Amino acid sequence: MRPITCSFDPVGISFQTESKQENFEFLREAISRSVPGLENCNVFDPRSLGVPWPTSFPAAAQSKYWKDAEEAAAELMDQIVAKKAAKRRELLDTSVSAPMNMFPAANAPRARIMAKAALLIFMHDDVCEDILWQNRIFKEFSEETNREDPVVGPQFLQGILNWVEHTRKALPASMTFRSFNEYIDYRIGDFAVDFCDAAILLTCEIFLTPADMEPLRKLHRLYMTHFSLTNDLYSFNKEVVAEQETGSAVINAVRVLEQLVDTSTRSAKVLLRAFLWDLELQIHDELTRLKGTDLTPSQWRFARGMVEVCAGNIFYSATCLRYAKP
Amino acid sequence: MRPITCSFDPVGISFQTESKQENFEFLREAISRSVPGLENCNVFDPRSLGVPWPTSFPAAAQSKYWKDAEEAAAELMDQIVAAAKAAKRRELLDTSVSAPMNMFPAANAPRARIMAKAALLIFMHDDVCEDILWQNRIFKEFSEETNREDPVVGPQFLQGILNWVEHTRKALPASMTFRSFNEYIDYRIGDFAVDFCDAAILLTCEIFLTPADMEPLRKLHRLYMTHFSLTNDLYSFNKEVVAEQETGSAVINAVRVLEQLVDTSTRSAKVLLRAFLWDLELQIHDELTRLKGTDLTPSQWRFARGMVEVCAGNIFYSATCLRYAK
């Protein structure tokens, strides 16, 4: 299991659900014994590691092939270049920690693909604030990704390119949100769904047509909401310090809640954390309702993969050095 | 007509005709009167401007859309510098315009812009041979619009650029003193960016030819590739030799090969290559006579004629370029 640098929780409050989450039990069982779809993961209870774990998910799963992902990300970094080292170390650390936690089902080859893809996204995201050589590097990445999976790879790469196009567009500084639900709809747009959905299909080694995705859409919206709001909660402090120095806008659910509810910032964080707890229960309810419907094994595996992204995202954020001690 | 900074001839002997050439007559008629396929080009006698014109070709054609190409090449350079000594950039913009406007004179205003950007991408890579997603987008945006401008010709045009990039990588590290001139000619022909130049002719001439359409013109194509490459050798020799004395750089040039094989002076080797080039032009004219007797598609005939315009354009560009001079 990958070493943990730091652990933090912005809010500081943990909880326990009124009723057992049978639907999440597979994560807990995976810690002790092999469970379907988790053969490639180390599954652990973060509380045993000392990491604050204020969530309904009983465990977090991490791909056991993170060491390969580090080599892959480092290899790609050497091609691209062909306190700066400190920035590079953070880039490589984030490029591994995020996909290894969010998409833990990854085997060794697909983990390498995920880490390279994560590096490319994170390098572009940092940049926001000879072309043929550079175009060749990406083309080699597409070839290796396409070879590992002929079916999902093209969507996987298209998901990367769709994300770069969204980054270009900027929400207006003037624009404000009247309702939290309105903020959620905007914030959901920030998530790279096409990549993350393909990344689940890739790491879980399953294929779903877009029509197979229509039944899972309510769970999918729940997973995007939980992922996005979790990212806002853990990143809030990093944004405010950036706001003070560079005058950064702070587009964060915490700030929206503070304005809409007219409460303290500390209370806004508590409300967001609780909103996330209710989302986790809503995710659990949808899973129960979905089990009633005749679902395909791949559809169910995707439904479960979305749950693993949410839990892994919490673990990634809680152990992330950018967010802790900003 | 595009301003010329410099004019030079490495050898200095002029051509004198014993037999007038009917096939090359269309270039001459184009100066005084509009000729089919030259509606987009200014056709001139380079001697009238004061440029030395040591060739059987009666005229050179240069696109009337060069100013647009300068606009396009300047735009592409600005995107590239943003996504990332000044003397190299300005020279690069100059070579990126002068070469395609002279080599592919038929280009209209939109296709002239395409050629200048494509040429800029090729030249910058060649200098290099001597974040990533943002660079990739720049090429993808170039690839789009090229395909929109010409949906049929666009794919091989862009593929021709990529095929060249790979070939540059597949380049022998050193070439042994050539035992044979025919052997040297074959190696030079292999380097020729054939896929791109054939597509650039199709693009600029606004005609399309299948591979089967190209089978009749193959002897002319080989002559054109040879004349193009040997012309480049002749005019670049002074550039290569002076560099070779300063850096002990290897020289791979027809001038040096003949001087070695005939054991002759440099002045005589240059005269020998100049005459070999005139004999190639005579063979080009002879093949043009033979082709006319054979039934030929009008597009095929436009391609045969486009190859001649590349040869004459290359001569004018080579004499015009400052780097070949000084």
CA-closest candidate to residue B276, choices B291, B261, B293, B292: B261
Q: What span, in angstroms and rounded, lies between the C-alpha atoms of A191 and B310? A: 51
Question: How close does chain A come to B131, measured CA to CA in Å?
Answer: 5
Q: Which of B245, B292, B255 is nearest to B276 (CA)?
A: B255
Record: contact B121-A132, CB cut-off 8 A = yes
User: Nearest CA of chain B to the CA of A290: how many Å?
Assistant: 38
Both tokens assigned to B200: 């650039």
Residue pairs between chains A and B whose CB atoms are closer than 8 Å:
52
The SS3 assignment for A219 reads helix
- What is the spatial distance between Cα B87 and Cα B90, in angstroms, rounded to a whole number? 5
How far off is chain A from B123, nearest CA to CA, in Å? 10
Distance CA B243, CA A190 (A): 54
How far lies A261's CA from each of A255, A257, A264, A272, A276, in Å? 10, 6, 9, 11, 16
3-state secondary structure of A63: strand
DSSP states of B65-134 = THHHHHHHHHHHHHHHHHH--HHHHHHHHHHHHHHHHHHSTT--HHHHHHHHHHHHHHHHHHHHH--HHH
The answer to whether the beta carbons of residues B61 and B306 sit under 8 Å apart is no
The Cβ of residue A121 has, within 10 Å, a number of other Cβ atoms equal to 22
Interatomic CA distance for residues B265 and B259, integer angstroms: 6
Smallest CA-to-CA distance from B41 within B101, B128, B127, B87 is with B101
Exposure class string for A108-117: b at 16+ Cβ within 10 A, else e: ebbbbbbbbb
Locate breaks in chain B with C to N over 2.5 A; list the residue preceding each.
Answer: 84, 130
Give the structural domain span for A30: 22-318
CB A103 within 8 A of CB A66: no
Q: Is B110 exposed, middle or buried (0-12, 13-18, 19+ CB in 10 A)?
A: middle
Its sign, for the CA torsion A73, A79, A80, A83, is: positive
Cα–Cα dist B113/A242, whole Å? 42
What tokens were used for B218?
Answer: 């193959």
Does residue B169 fall inside a structural domain? Answer: yes
Chain centroid, CA B68 distance in Å: 20
Burial A7-24 (b: 16+ CB within 10 A, else e): bbbbbeeeeeeeeebebb
Partner-chain contact B131 A138, CB within 8 Å: no
Domain-located, residue B112:
yes
Distance in Å, alpha carbon of A186 to nearest chain B alpha carbon: 24
When computed from its CA atoms, the radius of gyration of chain B, rounded to whole angstroms, is 19
Q: Which of B9, B2, B102, B3 is nearest to B51 (CA)?
A: B9
Contact A127 B132 (CB under 8 A): no
Give chain A's radius of gyration (CA, Å).
19
Find the residue in B nearest to A77 (Cα): B132
3-class SS at B315? Answer: helix
Does the distance separating the beta carbons of B161 and A131 come in below 8 Å? Answer: no
d(CA A225, CA B54): 73
Distance CA A256, CA A267 (A): 12
Question: Which CATH number fits the domain that encloses residue B174?
Answer: 1.10.600.10
- Per CB-CB distance under 8 Å, the chain B contacts of A137 are 132
Kindly provide the b/e burial profile for residues A48-87, where b requires at least 16 CB atoms within 10 angstroms of the residue's own CB: eeebbbbbbbbbbbbbbbbebbbebbeebbeeeeeeeeee
Q: Which of A87, A130, A138, A168 to mutate to test the interface with B (most CBs of B within 10 A)?
A: A130
Query: What are the residues facing A63 on neighbouring strands?
Result: A41
Chain B: closest CA distance from residue A111 (Å): 20
Half-sphere exposure of B148 (CA within 13 A, CB side): 7
Residue B294 carries which side chain, given as an amino acid letter? T
Task: Give the DSSP H or E segment for A101.
Answer: helix A84-102
Report yes or no: A94 and A54 within 8 Å, Cβ to Cβ.
no
A133 and B125 in contact by Cβ < 8 A? yes
Q: Tell me the three state secondary structure of residue A69.
A: helix
Q: Does A241 map to a domain?
A: yes
Q: Quick check: is A128 in a domain?
A: yes
Interface test with A, best of B122, B133, B140, B162 (most A CBs within 10 A): B133
Of A127, A135, A164, the CB nearest to B139: A135
Among A118, A121, A120, which Cα is nearest to A134's?
A120
Tokens coding B301? 């005939």
Per the structure, how many domains does chain A have?
1
Give the Cα separation of A320 and A324 in Å (integer).
6
Q: Which residues touch A185 (CB under 8 Å, ≥6 apart)?
A: none
In a domain, A185, yes or no: yes
Residue B131's closest chain A neighbor by CA? A124
Can you give the resolution of this entry in Å?
Answer: 2.2
Q: Say how many residues make up chain A.
A: 326
Residues of A in contact with B158 (CB under 8 A): none
Residue A300 in tokens: 């169910």
Report CB contact under 8 Å: A123, B135. Answer: no
A133 at B interface, C-beta within 8 A:
yes
**DSSP assignment string, B31-64:** HHS--TT-TTEEEE-TTTTT----SS---EEEET
B130 interaction partners in chain A (CB closer than 8 Å): none
Q: For tokens 């899973």, what's the residue? A: A287
Window 241-300 of B, Cβ < 8 Å to A:
none
CA distances from B196 to A14, B96, B109, B119, B303 (A): 64, 15, 19, 10, 14
The answer to whether B137 contacts A164, with C-beta atoms less than 8 Å apart, is yes
Q: Residue holding tokens 């919206």?
A: A221
B83 inside domain: yes
d(CA B62, CA B84): 33
Phi, psi of A156 (to 5 degrees): -55, -55
Residue A303 in contact with partner chain B when CB distance is under 8 A:
no
Contact B135 A136 (CB under 8 A): no
For residue B207, report the phi and psi dihedrals to the nearest 5 degrees: -130, 160
Q: What is the DSSP letter of A130?
A: -
Nearest to B128 among A133, A137, A164 (CB): A133
* Interchain contact A161–B (C-beta under 8 A): yes
Q: Residue B101 in contact with residue B63, Cβ under 8 Å?
A: yes
The CB density around residue A236, as the number of other CB atoms within 10 Å, is: 21
Residue with tokens 């004219």: B285
User: Minimal Cα distance from B79: which residue of A?
Assistant: A131
Q: Among B104, B70, B119, B106, which residue's Cα sits nearest to residue B90? A: B70
**How is residue A213 annotated by DSSP?**
G
A281-288 long-range CB contacts below 8 Å, 24 or more apart?
A: A281/A17, A281/A56, A282/A222, A283/A219, A283/A222, A283/A223, A283/A226, A283/A307, A283/A310, A284/A21, A284/A23, A284/A24, A284/A56, A286/A218, A286/A219, A286/A222, A287/A23, A287/A219, A288/A23
Q: How was this structure determined?
A: X-ray
Could you tell me if residue B3 is inside a domain?
A: no
In DSSP terms, A43 is beta-bridged to A61
Minimal CA separation from A301 to chain B, in Å: 31
A272 near A237, Cβ under 8 Å?
Answer: no
Distance CA B318, CA B98 (A): 10
> Smallest Cα–Cα separation from B314: which of B253, B232, B258, B195?
B232
Burial class (CB within 10 angstroms; exposed 0-12, middle 13-18, buried 19+) of A31? middle
How far is A128 from chain B, CA to nearest CA, in Å?
A: 9
| Partner residue facing A123 (CB), from B80, B132, B165 | B132
Nearest CA in chain B to A76: B132
Identify whether A36 is part of a domain.
yes
Report the residue of chain B nearest A135, measured CA to CA.
B136
Tokens representing B229 are 């490459």
Q: Which residues of A touch B135 (CB under 8 A)?
A: 131, 134-135
How near does any CA of chain A get to the CA of B145, in Å?
A: 17
Contacts with A123 from chain B: Cβ below 8 Å? 131-133
Residue contact A132–B125, C-beta within 8 A: yes
Are the C-beta atoms of B8 and B324 separated by less than 8 Å?
yes
**CB contacts, 8 Å: B121 with chain A:** 131-132
Task: Give the span between the Cα atoms of A198 and A306, in whole angstroms.
Answer: 11
Task: Indicate yes or no: CB of A127 within 8 angstroms of CB of B124.
Answer: no
* DSSP SS3 for A237: helix
For B135, the closest chain A residue by CA position comes to: A131
Q: Do residue B165 and residue A136 have CB atoms under 8 angstroms apart?
A: yes
